[PDB]
RNA sequence: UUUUGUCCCUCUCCAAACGAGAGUACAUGCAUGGGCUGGCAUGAGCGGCACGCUCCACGACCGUGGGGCUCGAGGGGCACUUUACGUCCCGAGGCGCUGAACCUUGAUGCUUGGAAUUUCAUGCUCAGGGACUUU
RNA sequence: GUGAGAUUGUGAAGGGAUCUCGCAGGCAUCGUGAGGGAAGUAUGGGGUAGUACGAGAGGAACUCCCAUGCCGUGCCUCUGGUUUCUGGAGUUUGUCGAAGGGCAAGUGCUCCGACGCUAUCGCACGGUGGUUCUCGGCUGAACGCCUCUAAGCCAGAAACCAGUCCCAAGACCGGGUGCCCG
RNA sequence: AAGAUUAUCCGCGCAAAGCGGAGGCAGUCCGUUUUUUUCUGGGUCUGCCGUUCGGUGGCAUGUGCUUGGCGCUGCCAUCUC
RNA sequence: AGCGACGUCGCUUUUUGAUCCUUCGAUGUCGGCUCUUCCUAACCUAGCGCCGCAGAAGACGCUAAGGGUUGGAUUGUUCACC
RNA sequence: CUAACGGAAUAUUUUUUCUUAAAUGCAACGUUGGAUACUGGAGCGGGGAAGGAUUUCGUGCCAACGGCACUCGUACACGA
């Protein structure tokens, strides 16, 4: 009910909104720009065009440009993940449920790696020993349900097996209120 | 309408909710006591002391928990105390009664 | 559960206040988007014509595209052009003409405004439609009406007025792959039941070897359409009032919300208007559900009722229902280690000092 | 090219299929995770003549003062008030010390936990597509 | 009656596939119901009335009205129940110099426990048309009478058939629409 | 499907009978009149002129809705087509 | 009414017999539990006809298989039986 | 479980130039360290008897084979 009898506000909105809308509406040039790219792109795959081409945003741009610009900034115009360290906090509750006392925790470990890939959007996880203990703290049945990491996606040269060339370390670090506290991204 | 208060807890039992027992009572009659969460019954049954049970109405009441500053303050309500006449009398009778 | 008064001609529980279970159903408007004529042919209804929106919103397109995803959304665009075709095909002339000429059931194409103003859980944000037959005087009159209602929006109250019995079509709550028992209700054998137990003793005869169908077997259970009847609409809601408000509920005397302290799991919702039906409701939690006019004449002690809510208790649920209204609840503890005084008072000056500083 | 499917991803569906969706990005999706909702039922910790608590007040956040309340014991025992060392109790006894406390109360309705599949914000962060069918 | 052109094809002085060819399809969407299936059921109150009926003894009946059953079919506000939420809390034994705080104890062990599940131990809901059965009839000739009967015809039962409901129309049902095609 | 109807149209009207409504202009390729009655056509290309739309913008307003944002119409003007 | 003797024909096959076709290089014996569905020679329910049916109550018949149709006890049971 | 190492811990793609990213191998199997458990001495421990006897070790080495599997061996191979 946010207006009535709160006199005259009406003219103010209708117009005011009239800009914000107009602006929003206005705010892009779209799909065909990409269809000029496509006829060529079907000739073979260009991601530097693609990660940024894939996203848009017309009601966001005073605020989305804030998150997008970092992330676009190495990443959405030409990928190239850093080489970053962040320190995080994860919610085991959903994670630990149901299945066996005897398996929850190893699987958690796997899952930890997985989260990390998931997080770093950009995959591969090496873990600190402390974490190793941290985990096996009880040993299976229980585990401590909330985790504190310092994680580094670090860059590597040509290395290793499989598919190697970029790599991560993830580590324990602690002090509770984890569920409030947050993860923060470690300036590099 | 009509909320009983689940005694033990004290909590208002809206028309649904909870469960109802009828006890005996000779200094009055025949009550019903309505219990909310059987946790409240069980504890009762478990014959705990309302005077120490956290969750009860008693427990606040008795326990520092209600106490003094919140609403138990006294000797601060409005009043007047002052000197009063007979009413329906000339000045001389009012002097005579008050005096000697 | 709800409170309302009893009475009838000579019931046992006449003259009583009663408390009853009720359902609440999220509601805002569907917008009328087309008109349909199927005509009855001696082979049933066959659609004869469909009548249009002239403006086609994105959601509805999102559904009206198999998806959004990369969707170019290009549906309707030609259709979209058609405002020109005022000066162009007077399709409307043709349609109507047909309608008059022949149509026999008129359905209206309506679809929802599917955000429903909901936040989160649940989704299928795709969008949804259905045909609604309209009945009540004269094809043209109907049509006019319909026509008049084209692009126009519907609120339940426009087709309803409460106290009413209505009928319901829904998908069961799902159970997946089901123990035949739940699916059908068979009874076991002893403890000494070698080689299993649920799976009952006798199922077919030699004659006829042809396994009989009056036995069943396991299977899905739940997730069914069922087209269920006689659900009374006990109340028709509107306009969520604010920075906390809408409701008002008489004897509430408070001006509450129509939302429980919880107010539906995964669904802390009430985000527009509601249908309060007496009783419960089919299907899975959190889901879309179809109200249809009742078919029973419903003549009854029941219809024939002065069901005219008074009052609804509005628990928590969640954690248990223990203290109605967060408002009340708040009182009872009132002060605690947090905030309150020993933190809030500090907070009020502290806050005051900061606020003043940033401005000056 | 139009795609749909598939990378991607949801839990309502869900054995698998299948389904149902989806983001498609900003008061978002997304998570930190805020707030907030619960729940269980007063922590650790520390304290008992101080300190706590409580009231008032000032400073207003504070420092602080005032007022008021509060203002928990069971212990084997042992020292020392001496040669003047002003300890100026010399004993009576007082002052401490002395292994464990036990329960308690207080600060503390604490403390603590609240998803898998909780509530939401005028919070925070993060990021938003590989394939391939393919007309 | 008997195309072409491309694509495409291979082992034998060439055929053909494939596609696309004088009007292709895609996608999507929304639809109809053939036809199948198909469900409710009885007893109780109120009441009639102590009325009818009966001389009495005794002693009935419908609407009508309220209910209820069992059955069916939904459901979870509530309540109950269920707990590996290893959720909380609590407790023993042992186990970690050391409290803390964990551990083991093949879910150590209790009390508490939402949620979810779920229970006739919880909550909800169960449509009106037709044709007939007997049967009675009506009319009614045979047969100058008469007859329900022949002709004719009315009315008609928990029966059946449909409505409703559950499937979705021929492995081969089709309509209506959006958008790309050709 | 509507007449044994393919011709400059549509609409309306059982149906009659009838009715109404029915843009232009120049430039351009090809060529008939014939289900027994066009009658210059056919045919595209352009050009050129104008209801509509389509877009642009603005101004009001109506409408409608959230974490006052989202959503849409009037009219006006512009813009374009 | 309702019967129905004496007769005297029917009718059936959830009886029991008779018969040995088949089955012995195999068609898993009791009972019972469960569970379905079906049959009608309808016990109950719907509705008709009769009554040696006043009421009352029963009885008889039709039309009807759509619907319904039990707990124990004792007894392996079956049957029996309270 | 984990890090590490060590084996044929081996790969990858291409528009782009391209490479991170974006899609699976390796070796699921070795070791050393590390982390967690378990047994629970009537040992899964440690020693005989019969039984067996080369299985032992060393070294090698990985076709089969050890029901997965081995880059490990009571295998093979070669010797001791």
DSSP 8-state class, residue C305: -
Q: Which chains does chain B touch, 3 or more C-beta pairs < 8 A?
A: C
Protein residue at shortest CA distance from C1' of H8: A161
Burial (CB count within 10 angstroms: exposed 0-12, middle 13-18, buried 19+), residue B40: buried
Task: Locate all alpha helices (DSSP H) within chain B, ordered by sequence.
Answer: 38-45, 57-62, 91-99
DSSP 8-state class, residue A38: H
Beta strands in B6-85 (DSSP E): 12-13, 19-21, 33-35
The residue whose two tokens read 């026999």 is C104
Cα B77–chain centre separation: 18
Residue among C65, C68, C72, C238 with most chain A CBs within 10 A, to mutate: C72
Cβ contact C32:C153 at 8 Å? yes
Q: What radius of gyration do chain C's Cα atoms show?
A: 28
**By C-alpha distance, which of C107, C129, C121 is closest to C31?**
C129
Q: Give CA–CA dist C325/C90, Å, rounded.
A: 58
Q: Give CA–CA dist C111/C118, Å, rounded.
A: 16
Q: C-alpha distances in angstroms, A111 versus A81, A107, A167, A171?
A: 21, 6, 17, 15
DSSP 8-state class, residue C173: P
Q: Give CA–CA dist C237/C257, Å, rounded.
A: 11
In chain C, residues with a C-beta closer than 8 Å to the C-beta of B72 are none
**By C-alpha distance, which of C48, C46, C68 is closest to C57?**
C68
> In this structure, which long-range contacts are made by residues C36-41, counting pairs with CB atoms below 8 Å and at least 24 apart in sequence?
C36/C106, C36/C107, C36/C108, C36/C109, C36/C131, C37/C95, C37/C98, C37/C99, C37/C102, C37/C103, C37/C104, C37/C105, C37/C106, C37/C107, C38/C103, C38/C104, C38/C105, C38/C107, C39/C102, C39/C103, C39/C104, C39/C105, C40/C104, C40/C105
Q: Which chains does chain C touch, 3 or more C-beta pairs < 8 A?
A: A, B
Torsion angle in degrees (nearest 10) through CA of B19, B24, B27, B29: 70
How many residues make up chain B in this entry? Answer: 100
Question: Hey, are the CB atoms on C242 and A31 less than 8 Å from each other?
Answer: no
Touching pair C, A by Cβ (3+ pairs < 8 Å): yes
Distance C48 CA to E152 C1' (A): 46
Burial (CB count within 10 angstroms: exposed 0-12, middle 13-18, buried 19+), residue C114: buried
Beta strands in chain A (DSSP E): 84-91, 126-127, 146-155, 166-172, 184-186
The Cβ of residue A85 has, within 10 Å, a number of other Cβ atoms equal to 19
Give the protein-side footprint of strand F (Cβ within 7 Å): A 2-3, 11, 13-22, 24-26, 59; C 28-29, 55, 57, 80-88, 90, 93-94, 97, 117, 119, 153, 240, 271-272
**By C-alpha distance, which of A118, A181, A114, A124 is closest to A147?**
A181
Q: Residues of C at the annotated binding site?
A: 317
C242 touches A: beta carbon within 8 Å:
yes
Question: Hey, are the CB atoms on C313 and B15 less than 8 Å from each other?
Answer: yes
3-class DSSP state for residue C234?
strand
Q: Which of residues 98-157 of A touch strand H (CB under 7 A)?
A: 106, 109, 117, 121-124, 126-127, 129, 132-133, 135-140
What resolution does the deposited structure have, in angstroms?
5.6
Query: Crossing angle for the helix pair C91-101 and C139-148, nearest 10 degrees?
Result: 150
Cβ contact C93:C147 at 8 Å? no
Q: For residue A125, what are its two tokens?
A: 């996880």
Measure the CA angle with vertex C304, ends C300 and C310; round to 5°. Answer: 130
Q: What are phi and psi of C229, to 5 degrees?
A: -120, 165
Q: Give CA–CA dist A162/A141, Å, rounded.
A: 33
Cβ contact C275:C233 at 8 Å? yes
A32 touches C: beta carbon within 8 Å:
no
Measure the CA angle with vertex C349, ends C346 and C353; round to 5°. Answer: 130
Burial (CB count within 10 angstroms: exposed 0-12, middle 13-18, buried 19+), residue C237: buried
């Amino acid at each position: 009910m946010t207006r009535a009898g709160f006199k005259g506000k009406v003219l103010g909105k209708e117009k005011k909104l009239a800009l914000l809308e107009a602006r929003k509406k206005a705010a892009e040039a779209r799909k065909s720009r990409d269809d000029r790219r496509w006829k060529r792109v079907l000739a073979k795959m260009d991601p530097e065009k693609r990660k940024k081409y894939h996203g848009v945003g017309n009601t966001a741009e005073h605020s989305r440009v804030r998150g997008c610009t970092r992330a676009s900034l190495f990443k959405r115009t030409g990928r190239k993940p850093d080489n970053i360290v962040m320190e995080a906090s994860i919610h085991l509750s959903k994670l630990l449920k149901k299945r066996t006392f005897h398996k929850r925790a190893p699987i958690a470990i796997k899952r930890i790696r997985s989260f990390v890939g998931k997080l770093m959007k950009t995959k591969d996880n090496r873990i600190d020993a402390s974490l190793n203990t941290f985990i096996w703290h009880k040993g299976v049945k229980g585990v401590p349900g909330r985790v504190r990491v310092r994680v580094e996606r670090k860059s590597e040269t040509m290395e290793g097996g499989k598919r190697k060339h970029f790599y991560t370390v993830i580590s324990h670090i602690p002090v509770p209120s984890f569920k409030n506290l947050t993860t923060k991204v470690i300036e590099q | 309408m009509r909320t009983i208060d689940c005694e033990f807890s004290h909590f208002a039992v809206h028309p649904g909710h909870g469960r109802r027992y009828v006890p005996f009572a000779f200094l009055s009659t025949k009550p019903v006591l309505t219990f909310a969460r059987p946790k409240c019954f069980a504890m009762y049954m478990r014959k705990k002391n309302p005077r120490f049970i956290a969750w009860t109405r008693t427990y606040r009441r008795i326990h520092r928990k209600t106490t003094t500053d919140r609403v138990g303050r006294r000797r601060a309500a409005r009043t007047v105390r002052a000197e009063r006449a007979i009413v329906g009398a000339e000045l001389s009778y009012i002097q005579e009664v008050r005096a000697k | 559960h709800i409170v309302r008064d009893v009475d009838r001609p000579g019931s046992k529980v006449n003259k009583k206040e009663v408390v009853e279970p009720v359902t609440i159903l999220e509601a805002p408007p569907m917008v009328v988007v087309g008109i349909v004529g199927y005509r009855q042919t001696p082979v049933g209804h066959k659609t004869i014509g469909t009548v249009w929106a002239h403006h086609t919103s994105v959601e509805f397109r999102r559904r009206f595209y198999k998806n959004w995803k990369q969707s170019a959304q290009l549906a309707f665009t030609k259709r979209k052009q058609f405002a020109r075709t005022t000066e162009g095909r007077l399709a409307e002339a043709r349609t109507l003409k047909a309608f008059e000429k022949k149509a026999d059931i008129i359905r209206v194409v309506a679809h929802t405004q599917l955000r429903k103003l909901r936040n989160n859980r649940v989704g299928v944000k795709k969008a949804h439609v259905s045909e609604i037959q309209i009945n009540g005087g004269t094809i043209a009159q109907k049509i006019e009406l319909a026509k008049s209602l084209l692009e126009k929006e519907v609120r339940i109250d426009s087709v309803f007025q409460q106290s009413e019995a209505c009928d319901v079509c829904a998908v069961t709550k799902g159970h997946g792959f089901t123990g035949v028992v739940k699916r059908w209700g068979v009874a076991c054998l002893p403890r000494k039941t070698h080689r299993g137990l649920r799976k009952v003793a006798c199922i077919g005869a030699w004659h006829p070897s042809r396994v009989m169908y009056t036995v069943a077997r396991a299977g899905q259970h739940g997730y069914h359409h069922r087209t269920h009847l006689n659900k009374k609409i006990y109340q028709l809601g509107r306009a969520v009032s604010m920075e906390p408000n809408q409701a008002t509920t008489a004897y509430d005397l408070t001006a509450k919300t129509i939302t429980p302290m919880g107010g539906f799991v995964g669904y802390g919702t009430v985000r527009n208007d509601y249908v309060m039906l007496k009783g419960s409701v089919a299907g899975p939690r959190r889901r879309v559900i179809t109200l249809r006019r009742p078919m029973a004449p419903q003549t009854s002690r029941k219809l024939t009722e002065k069901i005219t809510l008074k009052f609804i208790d509005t628990s928590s649920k969640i954690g248990h229902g223990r203290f109605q209204t967060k408002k009340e609840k708040s009182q009872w503890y009132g002060p605690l280690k947090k905030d309150r005084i020993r933190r809030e008072e500090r907070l009020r000056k502290e806050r005051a000092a900061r606020a003043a500083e940033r401005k000056a």
